[PDB]
Design a binder for this molecule. Sequence first.
Ligand SMILES: *[C@@H]1O[C@H](CO)[C@@H](O)[C@H](O)[C@H]1NC(C)=O
Length: 109
Amino acid sequence: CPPSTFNCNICRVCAGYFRFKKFCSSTHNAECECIEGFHCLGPQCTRCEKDCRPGQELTKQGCKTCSLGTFNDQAGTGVCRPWTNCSLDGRSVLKTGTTEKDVVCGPLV
Ligand SMILES: *[C@@H]1O[C@H](CO)[C@@H](O)[C@H](O)[C@H]1NC(C)=O
């Protein structure tokens, strides 16, 4: 297919933020994937999106901010998880929660 051997047509080129997932051959077209530090945005991978910051998680529709009351301290990986509930643990709140940081509970009251 890169030399004219035509259903085979013209080969896709994977450059920049794209690299080759599957190389082109006589039987099939080349397939792209996103470079490390990036992920496919949409089902066909027409765009790449930068891996998510802390305070976000990777969904099927790209990076999304953690919903209020959840956090993700990891950069480029992990899931938004609920804040520690100090009250259920018999403790009080010493430092409040954020999208990036869990609540810090105090000593046993
Ligand atoms: C902890 O969970 C209890 C039980 O549902 C609830 O009363 C309390 O408001 C919760 N607090 C936080 C900070 O999540």
